[PDB]
Enzyme design. Structure first.
Site, PDB file in Angstrom:
ATOM      1  CG  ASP A  68      -1.864   1.156   1.252  1.00  0.00           C
ATOM      2  OD1 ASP A  68      -2.803   1.214   0.432  1.00  0.00           O
ATOM      3  OD2 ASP A  68      -1.658   2.023   2.125  1.00  0.00           O
ATOM      4  NE  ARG A  74       9.072   4.276  -0.830  1.00  0.00           N
ATOM      5  CZ  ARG A  74       9.317   3.840   0.401  1.00  0.00           C
ATOM      6  NH1 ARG A  74       9.833   2.633   0.588  1.00  0.00           N
ATOM      7  NH2 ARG A  74       9.063   4.616   1.445  1.00  0.00           N
ATOM      8  CB  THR A  86      -2.639   5.720  -3.884  1.00  0.00           C
ATOM      9  OG1 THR A  86      -1.433   6.333  -3.415  1.00  0.00           O
ATOM     10  CG2 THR A  86      -3.110   6.477  -5.118  1.00  0.00           C
ATOM     11  CB  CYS A 146      10.675  -0.909  -8.879  1.00  0.00           C
ATOM     12  SG  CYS A 146      10.500   0.862  -8.563  1.00  0.00           S
ATOM     13  CD1 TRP A 160       1.022   2.641  -7.452  1.00  0.00           C
ATOM     14  CD2 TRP A 160      -1.068   2.169  -6.811  1.00  0.00           C
ATOM     15  NE1 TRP A 160       0.927   1.280  -7.300  1.00  0.00           N
ATOM     16  CE2 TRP A 160      -0.346   0.964  -6.904  1.00  0.00           C
ATOM     17  CE3 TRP A 160      -2.410   2.122  -6.420  1.00  0.00           C
ATOM     18  CZ2 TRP A 160      -0.919  -0.272  -6.620  1.00  0.00           C
ATOM     19  CZ3 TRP A 160      -2.978   0.893  -6.140  1.00  0.00           C
ATOM     20  CH2 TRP A 160      -2.233  -0.288  -6.241  1.00  0.00           C
ATOM     21  CG  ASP A 176       7.308  -8.450   5.851  1.00  0.00           C
ATOM     22  OD1 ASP A 176       6.918  -8.028   4.740  1.00  0.00           O
ATOM     23  OD2 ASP A 176       8.417  -8.997   6.005  1.00  0.00           O
ATOM     24  CB  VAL A 177       3.643  -9.148   2.321  1.00  0.00           C
ATOM     25  CG1 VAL A 177       2.988  -7.805   2.065  1.00  0.00           C
ATOM     26  CG2 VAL A 177       5.093  -9.131   1.865  1.00  0.00           C
ATOM     27  NE  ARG A 178       8.979 -10.589   4.051  1.00  0.00           N
ATOM     28  CZ  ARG A 178      10.303 -10.606   4.143  1.00  0.00           C
ATOM     29  NH1 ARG A 178      11.013 -11.421   3.374  1.00  0.00           N
ATOM     30  NH2 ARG A 178      10.921  -9.806   5.000  1.00  0.00           N
TER      31      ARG A 178
HETATM   32  N1  LIG Z   1       8.077  -6.807   2.652  1.00  0.00           N
HETATM   33  C1  LIG Z   1       7.147  -5.713   2.572  1.00  0.00           C
HETATM   34  N2  LIG Z   1       5.881  -5.913   2.804  1.00  0.00           N
HETATM   35  C2  LIG Z   1       5.009  -4.917   2.734  1.00  0.00           C
HETATM   36  N3  LIG Z   1       5.435  -3.707   2.430  1.00  0.00           N
HETATM   37  C3  LIG Z   1       6.702  -3.492   2.195  1.00  0.00           C
HETATM   38  C4  LIG Z   1       7.582  -4.487   2.261  1.00  0.00           C
HETATM   39  N4  LIG Z   1       8.759  -3.999   1.986  1.00  0.00           N
HETATM   40  C5  LIG Z   1       8.620  -2.721   1.751  1.00  0.00           C
HETATM   41  N5  LIG Z   1       7.354  -2.415   1.880  1.00  0.00           N
HETATM   42  C6  LIG Z   1       6.764  -1.165   1.721  1.00  0.00           C
HETATM   43  O1  LIG Z   1       5.698  -1.234   0.752  1.00  0.00           O
HETATM   44  C7  LIG Z   1       5.862  -0.212  -0.241  1.00  0.00           C
HETATM   45  C8  LIG Z   1       6.100  -0.859  -1.618  1.00  0.00           C
HETATM   46  S1  LIG Z   1       6.816   0.360  -2.765  1.00  0.00           S
HETATM   47  C9  LIG Z   1       5.562   0.855  -3.989  1.00  0.00           C
HETATM   48  C10 LIG Z   1       4.271   1.291  -3.258  1.00  0.00           C
HETATM   49  C11 LIG Z   1       3.052   1.368  -4.199  1.00  0.00           C
HETATM   50  N6  LIG Z   1       3.490   1.608  -5.589  1.00  0.00           N
HETATM   51  C12 LIG Z   1       2.097   2.482  -3.741  1.00  0.00           C
HETATM   52  O2  LIG Z   1       0.923   2.534  -4.193  1.00  0.00           O
HETATM   53  O3  LIG Z   1       2.496   3.361  -2.892  1.00  0.00           O
HETATM   54  C13 LIG Z   1       7.058   0.674   0.154  1.00  0.00           C
HETATM   55  O4  LIG Z   1       6.599   1.954   0.614  1.00  0.00           O
HETATM   56  C14 LIG Z   1       7.775  -0.091   1.294  1.00  0.00           C
HETATM   57  O5  LIG Z   1       8.054   0.787   2.394  1.00  0.00           O
END
Ligand SMILES: Nc1ncnc2c1ncn2[C@@H]1O[C@H](CSCC[C@H](N)C(=O)O)[C@@H](O)[C@H]1O
Ligand SMILES: Nc1ncnc2c1ncn2[C@@H]1O[C@H](CSCC[C@H](N)C(=O)O)[C@@H](O)[C@H]1O
Lengths: 288, 288
Positions: free
Chosen positions: B29, B267, B33, B98, B269, B74-76
């Site tokens: 997220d 970062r 956005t 990215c 959207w 965390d997503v893990r």
């Molecule tokens: N392992 C993870 N799990 C969840 N979020 C993470 C993560 N590692 C980094 N992030 C966070 O998740 C975001 C992904 S970056 C791109 C965010 C996306 N394009 C947007 O709509 O904003 C980053 O802000 C980062 O801080």
């Protein structure tokens, strides 16, 4: 404390057919609190002249007032010719920097150092913007300062400005703990604090979502006055603007840090206190 | 480029008597956005679950959505049990970080490093939130990424997600130069950019007062793209929010610096691009 004695000059009320917009000189403007309060009260401003040095404060004014503010640089660059060529003024306002006026400094330098003596610059511009004898135009002036001053300093200021300093505490109308002295000749100078229901009296109305106020109000222990997710967190800048009466997201105008926003908001006036002070000007001047 | 071939699954439109609010899973997220765009389109949100690590982004969400967001860490930490206990989802969204997917790095680490492989985490949660066979519930998903990727990386992503990546450039609807790939199965996935008159197309509509745009639009010479008082000045953060389609003073939620607001807004959207993408969901789901 009755050391000096002088009656306050009360001007006769002007009717609506001879009603004119205000010309405002704002010496130590900083964050443009005066013109903000004037626009919030719905008063037509014909001319607003702010003599500000700091570029962040000038940026605050240029963003939040859209080129309405006529900028001067340092107050020492202002002469009597600049006052007499910019038209006669209807409202003169200002608060001198209290770096050496505050007695919270152990090694304070006093009234007669380059941070305090700028007050006398104010007096000089008070002497130039004041109309001469025979002119019945309503001329109003307002000086602000902190409560933490010496007896001789406050006595000399009160003698020089020839007015009784009213003490106003922000806790009676807002959610801040600061008492300030106000010299001036506005009508109802010492009338009690008419608290507006739209003003945020408690601290929790100024907080964002997800944050719990630890105290009832904030000041101007090694802890923090707001719990956030069961964790003590620093008081936010937009929350500080809501405490000080400013509109939401006011002092976010450029690429300044947190410390710069603290330095600007600390020195700024309290919006509700000013709104109370500027309130009777509405019947003496134009309305919009 | 026709390397793979698969028809996009088009769901039948549901009438208004069987119309339900959306359940949204938002994996990466960051700045919220997606829920911002959903609230701007007037769509009832029954449940919004954001799995965000960074505390500044979580603070952005808690301020701008007032506890509506259900936070995961965390997503893990998300398993199939967490997906099946939080109800069936109607919209899954996300954009992987990215850091190593972008080919602007000379020493890039690729898709299979801990910044890129989080995409596969998405796929795993894409596999858990997808309904089984026999269920005619409209399930929609959206993955976002940059244009600066390799051929094999984009090919493997397109094969894994089984959709055609549409390229959308922010310059057709906003004042930014960034092309992004969008995988998904939304109706009208490659329909042209319907520019809204409320969207700020030019750069100068996104500027504040007293600033002149040097360029026509901004990118994502040792100069600065905005003149301010005949002086080159850095592009402001609130102006960056107006460029990226966000509401005015959006990412001012805590005591973060200028660099943190740049790292969050970079970062994030593009709001108009999403608004275009989320537009046909209005006839498939609830309206407010
Ligand atoms: N392992 C993870 N799990 C969840 N979020 C993470 C993560 N590692 C980094 N992030 C966070 O998740 C975001 C992904 S970056 C791109 C965010 C996306 N394009 C947007 O709509 O904003 C980053 O802000 C980062 O801080
Ligand atoms: N010599 C000078 N002339 C004009 N402004 C000055 C000045 N020296 C400092 N300043 C600026 O003027 C402000 C005075 S400090 C108090 C400001 C006032 N109470 C308010 O309403 O905001 C400070 O922000 C300082 O940056």
């Amino acid at each position: 404390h009755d050391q000096e004695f002088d009656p306050p000059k009360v001007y006769p009320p002007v009717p609506a057919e001879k009603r004119k917009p205000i010309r405002v000189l704002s010496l130590f403007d900083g964050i443009a609190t005066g013109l903000l309060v004037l626009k919030d009260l719905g008063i037509q401003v014909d001319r607003y002249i702010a003599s500000e040095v700091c570029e962040d404060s000038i940026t605050v004014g240029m963003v939040r007032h859209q080129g309405k503010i006529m900028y001067v640089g340092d107050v020492r660059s202002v002469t009597q010719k600049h006052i007499q060529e910019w038209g006669p003024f209807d409202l003169v306002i200002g608060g001198s920097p209290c770096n050496d006026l505050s007695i919270v400094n152990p090694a304070r330098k006093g009234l007669y150092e380059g941070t305090g003596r700028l007050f006398f610059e104010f007096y000089r511009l008070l002497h130039d913007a004041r109309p001469k004898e025979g002119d019945d135009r309503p001329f109003f002036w307002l000086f602000e300062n902190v409560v933490a001053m010496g007896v001789s300093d406050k006595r000399d200021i009160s003698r020089f400005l020839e007015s009784n300093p009213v003490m106003i505490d922000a806790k009676e109308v807002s959610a801040a703990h600061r008492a300030r002295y106000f010299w001036g000749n506005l009508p109802g100078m010492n009338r009690p604090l008419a608290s507006t229901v739209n003003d945020k009296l408690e601290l929790q109305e100024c907080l964002e979502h997800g944050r719990i106020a630890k105290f009832s109000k904030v000041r101007t222990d090694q802890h923090f006055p707001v719990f956030m997710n069961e964790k003590e967190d620093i008081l936010w800048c937009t929350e500080m603007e809501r405490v000080f009466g400013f509109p939401v997201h006011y002092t976010d105008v450029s690429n300044m840090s947190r410390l710069a926003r603290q330095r600007l908001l600390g020195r700024s006036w309290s919006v509700p206190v000013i709104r109370h002070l500027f309130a009777p000007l509405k019947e003496y001047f134009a309305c919009v």
